[PDB]
């Protein structure tokens, strides 16, 4: 159909973060079986392979910002590939990797569709500017390059010349914030970005939260929604094998509800799954839990309802 | 009183399902202590023993439908015993076993009370017709025999000649669907059976779900409610020792709330607890968790509120 027409793009990348192992995101998510689990329901699955990310050896950092040029080249290659598969009219399922690739993932998406909206589901805001960071790990900094309101607040980081800020601050929604820097909270209150942190989720119930989210985004105009999703935004009971586990996160049920509502919009346009580290499972069973969780999230983004599905023929035959 | 006047009927039966061990439902639920935990609050507890289910050796199956005649004889004996103890005006607490016995449990209940309503709490719909099944395990097929709207859609399965469909499609409510076959979802959308899958529960909150359920059933007319309950409908963190654990289920708190609301109706008439398998506990502590969960569910169906109870005399003496 229009929905569940998928381009799958892997991105085995880790240099935006310290802990090596999130390169085995695409390896694991394909070997666990994702294309297969799509193709039962009417999913026009087309893989486009993992991107051959290069290796700049002299990745001389910025002051705090570490490994800038490899990340910039990576997200540039990714932005090209994602815009390419949105030219196919598919839904750019991207999986990595880390949040640093979401720069290119939303950039190439915005090349094709300038009027998008971002639902950034993460325990973190990831809105660190290169000035306001403390780690300088770029998975903490994707959002700052895409907000037009931070133009002038962004130094020209080497490797990000191709980057243009693409969304406004009133078009992005956070769901599930529970680990926020002082700088991040300051910018988040400064720009007036609508967010639903765990406070508001515990207040409203995830049904009310999703309803207010879709009213905030699509209540003015139907526009292609780009859900991007951290796996640590869930409570780490369900996803232990990820980079920054922060307790008191979203439950499995609530994330499934989020994805089912976003599917029932029918305006899903590009899905991003990041921060899956199989090297952080204390047992491989923990990895299995994290991956089955993420796969169930992705499948629920493409018609797999917990109430179930049926192909539209009479089964009483 | 009118409520908490209990007939307890065990049913040590397993032939509707493959995994041997749910015959130790009555053994375990009595040896954990259930009659005793009833009798403190004013529970006219009367056991009626485990039923002596026979063993037909030449249980020749249907095409997909396996073990039909032993299940049919079992549910016939059960329907006779349940109607017998509803002649005593008690509340037919039945525990098994599996969902195949719920055929006879609701059949004998409908013999006495034709205007009942079923709240089928389960992870599955169990609405497989003999045509639409894939396993042919009859715990996947109780509901198809009781719906009057599937008359003609039900082949004459050997052993189920005594079976008459008893309820309408608009009188049964599902709560907690999260694993539904395509045939099951097709029939569920076909008959317009009101269901509350985990999507709707995550949307509404269990208070709103129970309120809409009791408005949907009793909002027209006071009628005896037959809650029938799977233990896999809860999340398997609380109940691991059951046949089909499906993750993302109902929490323990929500199930307790369901039972407390159904008690506060006061129209509870027959309670069924199925699918308890102690042979599926990886440790006996897992069995202990599952059984204590189910026992607390049953006790909360008979006045045991989490706010507590008191016998109506002055305790300031």
């Amino acid at each position, epitope marked *: 159909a229009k929905s569940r027409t998928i381009g799958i793009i892997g991105a085995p990348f880790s240099k935006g973060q310290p802990r090596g192992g999130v390169e085995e995101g695409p390896t694991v998510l394909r070997k666990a079986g994702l294309l297969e689990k799509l193709k039962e329901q009417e999913c026009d699955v087309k893989d486009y392979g993992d991107l051959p990310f290069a290796d700049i050896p002299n990745d001389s950092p910025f002051q705090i910002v570490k490994n800038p040029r490899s990340v910039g080249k990576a997200s540039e290659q990714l932005a090209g590939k994602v815009a390419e598969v949105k030219k196919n009219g598919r839904i750019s399922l991207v999986l990595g990797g880390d949040h640093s690739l979401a720069i290119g993932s939303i950039s190439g998406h915005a090349r094709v569709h300038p009027d998008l909206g971002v639902i950034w589901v993460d325990a973190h805001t990831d809105i660190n500017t290169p000035l306001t960071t403390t780690s300088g790990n770029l998975h903490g900094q994707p959002v700052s390059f895409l907000l037009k309101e931070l133009k002038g607040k962004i130094p020209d980081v080497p490797g990000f010349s191709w980057v243009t800020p693409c969304i406004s601050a009133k078009d992005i929604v956070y769901i599930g914030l529970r680990d926020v820097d002082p700088g991040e909270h300051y910018i988040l209150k400064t720009l007036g970005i609508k967010y639903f942190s765990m406070t508001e989720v515990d207040r409203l119930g995830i049904g009310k939260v999703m309803e207010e989210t879709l009213s905030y985004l699509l209540g003015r105009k139907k526009r292609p929604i780009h859900l991007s999703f951290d796996v640590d935004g869930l409570d780490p009971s369900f996803t232990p094998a990820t980079g920054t586990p922060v307790v008191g996160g979203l439950t499995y049920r609530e994330g499934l509800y989020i994805t089912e509502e976003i599917y029932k919009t029918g305006l899903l346009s590009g899905l991003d799954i990041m921060e899956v580290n199989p090297s952080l499972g204390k047992t491989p069973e923990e990895v299995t839990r994290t991956v*089955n969780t993420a796969v169930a999230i992705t499948l629920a983004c493409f018609g797999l309802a917990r109430e179930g599905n049926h192909k539209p023929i009479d089964y009483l035959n | 009183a009118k409520s908490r006047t209990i007939g307890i009927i065990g049913a040590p039966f397993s032939k509707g399902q493959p995994r041997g061990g749910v015959e130790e439902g009555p053994t375990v639920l009595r040896k954990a202590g259930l009659l005793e935990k009833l009798k403190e609050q004013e529970c006219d507890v009367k056991d009626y023993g485990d039923l002596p289910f026979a063993d037909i050796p030449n249980d020749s199956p249907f095409q997909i439908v396996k073990n039909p005649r032993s299940v049919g004889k079992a549910s016939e004996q059960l329907a006779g015993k349940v109607a017998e103890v509803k002649k005593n005006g008690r509340i037919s607490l039945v525990l098994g076993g599996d969902h195949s016995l719920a055929i006879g449990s609701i059949s004998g209940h409908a013999r006495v009370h034709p205007d009942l309503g079923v709240i089928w709490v389960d992870a599955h719909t169990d609405i497989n017709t003999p045509l639409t099944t894939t396993s042919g395990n009859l715990h996947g097929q109780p509901v198809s025999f009781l719906l009057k709207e599937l008359k003609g859609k039900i082949p004459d399965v050997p052993g189920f000649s005594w079976v008459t469909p008893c309820i309408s499609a608009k009188d049964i409510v599902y709560i907690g669907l999260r694993d539904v076959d395509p045939g099951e979802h097709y029939i569920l959308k076909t008959l317009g059976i009101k269901y509350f899958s985990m999507t709707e529960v995550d949307r509404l909150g269990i208070g709103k779900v129970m309120e809409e359920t009791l408005s949907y059933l009793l909002g027209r007319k006071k009628r005896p409610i037959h809650l029938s309950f799977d233990v896999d409908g809860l999340d398997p963190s609380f109940t691991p020792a059951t046949g089909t654990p499906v993750v993302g289920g109902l929490t323990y708190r929500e199930g307790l709330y369901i039972t407390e609301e159904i008690y506060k109706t006061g129209l509870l008439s027959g309670l069924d607890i199925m699918e308890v398998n102690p042979s599926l506990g990886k440790t006996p502590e897992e069995v202990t968790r599952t059984v204590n969960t189910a026992v607390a569910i049953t006790l909360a169906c008979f006045g045991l509120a989490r706010e507590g109870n008191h016998k109506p005399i002055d305790y300031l003496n």
Partner: antibody
Amino acid sequence: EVQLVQSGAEVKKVKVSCKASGYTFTDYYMNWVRQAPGQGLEWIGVISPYNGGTTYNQKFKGKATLTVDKSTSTAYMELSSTAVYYCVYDLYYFDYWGQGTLVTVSS
Amino acid sequence: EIVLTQSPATLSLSPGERATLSCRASQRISNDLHWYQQKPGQAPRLLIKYASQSISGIPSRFSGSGSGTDFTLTISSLEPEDFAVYYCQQSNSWPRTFGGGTKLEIKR
């Protein structure tokens, strides 16, 4: 490709080698599995190469002990006192089967 | 701990037509098992990713079917070298049960 060297045939009344070769280690999970002679296949356990994450079989946690040797790409499964044994990779699949290691439980 | 039932225990069939097998699960594993070709005196050889998909040029005849407990292995182009003890094996439940053996034999 992913090719394995197992060692070895033993008679006991107990370590088993599985040398990874031909590829990049810490990319695939050492997964042990046995086959009783003339019988089906009995899964044992999965260890990560990053760390000794056990997740053994319920029945095999006592007798079988998997260890990790993540420096030199071998791994070891040890045993205390009857079947043939196999090490595979790609835990969701099983495509990278080893040699076959018969051990007898003998006197 | 999901018991995989291979309803043909052993089977004898000629070099010839289709030889569809069956691994019926105990639960709804939902398209999450595999298929194996343990030849005699050999390590097993994987055939199928998830009720489909023909791994790495395993030649022409090993299609399966899913959705969602009755999981089959069709041998469409029988190819009598394929007479081997087959196995199904679940993936997404712990711990990782196998089948039992689905020995294909020669019929003469």
